[PDB]
Each structure stands twice: as C-alpha cells, then as structure tokens.
Amino acid sequence: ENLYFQGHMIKSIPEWSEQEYLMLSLPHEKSDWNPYLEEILQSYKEFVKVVSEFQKVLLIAPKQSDFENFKDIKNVEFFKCDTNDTWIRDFGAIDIVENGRLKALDFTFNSELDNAVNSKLFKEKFKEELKKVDFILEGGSIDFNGEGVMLTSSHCLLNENLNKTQIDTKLKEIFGLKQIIWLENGFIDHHIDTLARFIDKNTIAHCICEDEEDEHYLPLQKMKEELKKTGFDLLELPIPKPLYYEERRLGATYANFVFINNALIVPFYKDKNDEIIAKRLSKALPNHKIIGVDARVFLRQNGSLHCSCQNRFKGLR
C-alpha cells in the first residue's frame, strides 16, 4: 500500500467511490447536434434529472440560455464557458489521491476550447490547482478497480502516443498502479469504456455478442478469452440487436454506464437486453440502484452515457 515515488504516494480512484459532482458539457446550436438539438437536449434532461436525485450535477455551456432548460431541477449547478465537444469524458480532468489529498490531472488532448475549459473551471469555480501531465490520454480509454489495477485497450494508448513497456511504466507511475491489463481484442477514438469495466474490485463487466452472424461475435469472443485469463469475476453485457440512423450502424454498448452516489446509470436502447443487463448488474451490485436511461440519441455522435460525463470525487482537496 504505502508506496512513494518521487515525493508522492498515489492511489487511483474507481468510479464507485463517493463523488461531489457529475459534470457534463451541454449540446448547443453550434456543434454537430443541430439537426436533432431538441432530441439530445431531451435525453440530457432525463439523464440530468435521474442523476440529480443522487448527487449534484454541474452543466457547462457557453450561454445562460443553454441552462434555461435545466433551471427547475434541484441539485443542478451551471458554469458559463465556451465549448463545442460535449464528450467531457474525453478531455475532462481526472482525479487521483496524491499524498492523501484529491488532485485533478489535466492530460493533453488532441483541441482548443476543450483544453481551456478545464483551466477556466478549476481557476474560476473550484479555485484549485490543476496539475498538467504531458501525456496523451482520454478518460474513456482507462478503467480502475481501486486496488492498483487498470484496464485499457492496446489499440488506444499505443496509437495515441514510446515503447509499450515505457507507456506501461509511465502509466503505472502516474496512477500508482501495480498492474495494467492490456486488452488486444474486441471492439464496438477506441475506448475501453465501450468494451469492459470494473463494477467492483473483483469484477469486470464486458460486452459479448450471442449472434454468430454478427461481425462483433469473434472479436468479443476473443476479448472474453483474454478476460478469462485475468482471474477477475466476469459479468456479460450482450450487445443489443443492430440499431441504425440514416443507414449507419450505431455503436450501442451497455458498458458505457456511469457510477454515481448510490446508483449505476445504464444506457437503454429499447431492446430486450436492456432488461437482461439491468437485472444482471443490479444483482451483482446489491447496494446500488440500477437505472436505465434511453441513450439512443447519444449514439448519433458515437458516444453514450459514460462518454458524456466526468466524475469529480468527494474528499479533502
């Protein structure tokens, strides 16, 4: 446990640890949500309403009029700041515990407004130091169990950034890790949060495909075999039947859930598997309320619930 490196003892934080905020970047009539603006905003409103029952929510947007649609919801705060990308998981600040204090890390993302967004937020609202790390990393490309283990895809971090051994060593040093599981197989920016996620310190929930005809079948079967070698308990998340927008197959995945205080918010796609994954996850998480939120509209811009938010954890800063 008590390991120090270059002045610091570091502990990585699993998503189920207690939080202060869930943070989101609203879609506005300027980015690529224009055609179905009211559509996605209605999804957001539902998502926000659900979360706000359990913990505070912070919504980031350029104009006060953007916030107007969410003014009635309890436990919702607002922060004026320009942006376009709504996928805050990609660029948002990532918390670690450093020498007993929570400390947010700002990795370099490839950009412009988003890169600034974090500085404004931390300078103006939180009034807190924002440690810049010179390393290419999106929040959706990593997943922690909170016991020094991290899950990631070989296709992500090796592409973005220079040995794997060096990247492995660097990542272990940054997050105080004892182990990184590098997944070669499976798919649905490549991101581990579309494929596999820790749901407790001993358990990994992961996408699977039951239809042999489907192109996902063998990649996900191979990913399954890899995950069987880790020794962690496995919980399966069968992908729904193909969904489409304008003849394009949407990357619907149940792995893009998000932990918040006392709850796990799971994407629903109006498929029979919604019910299967909710019951399965619910039984495996006896102290969480599992709540499905219609995530179909989100998929039009190639992301789901987890991609659209970032967690800010509770504790001494």
Cα distance between residue 279 and residue 268, in whole Å: 13
Q: Where are the beta strands (DSSP E) in 4-138?
A: 10-11, 19-25, 56-61, 76-80, 94-98, 101-108, 131-136
CA-based torsion, 214, 215, 218, 219: positive or negative: negative
DSSP state of 240: P
**Least CB distance from residue 190 to K ion, whole Å?**
17
**Least CB distance from residue 24 to K ion, whole Å?**
16
Q: Closest CB to K ion among 98 and 106?
A: 106
Q: Closest CB to K ion among 3 and 133?
A: 133
b/e code 227-256 from CB counts within 10 Å (16+ = b): beeeebeebbbbbbeebeeeeeebbbbbbb
Q: Closest CB to K ion among 46 and 106?
A: 106
Can you give the binding site for K ion, defined by CB under 5 A?
Answer: 91, 106-107, 109
Cα distance between residue 100 and residue 34, in whole Å: 44
Q: Closest CB to K ion among 3 and 116?
A: 116
**Least CB distance from residue 109 to K ion, whole Å?**
4
**Least CB distance from residue 82 to K ion, whole Å?**
16
**Least CB distance from residue 98 to K ion, whole Å?**
17
DSSP state of 5: B
**Chain interruptions in the chain, by residue before each (C–N > 2.5 Å):** 110, 161, 188
Cα distance between residue 306 and residue 295, in whole Å: 10
Q: Closest CB to K ion among 116 and 218?
A: 116
Cα distance between residue 165 and residue 143, in whole Å: 19
CB 54 within 8 A of CB 262: yes
**Least CB distance from residue 106 to K ion, whole Å?**
5
Q: Closest CB to K ion among 67 and 135?
A: 135
Q: Closest CB to K ion among 67 and 109?
A: 109
**Least CB distance from residue 95 to K ion, whole Å?**
13
Counting every residue written for the chain, the total comes to: 317
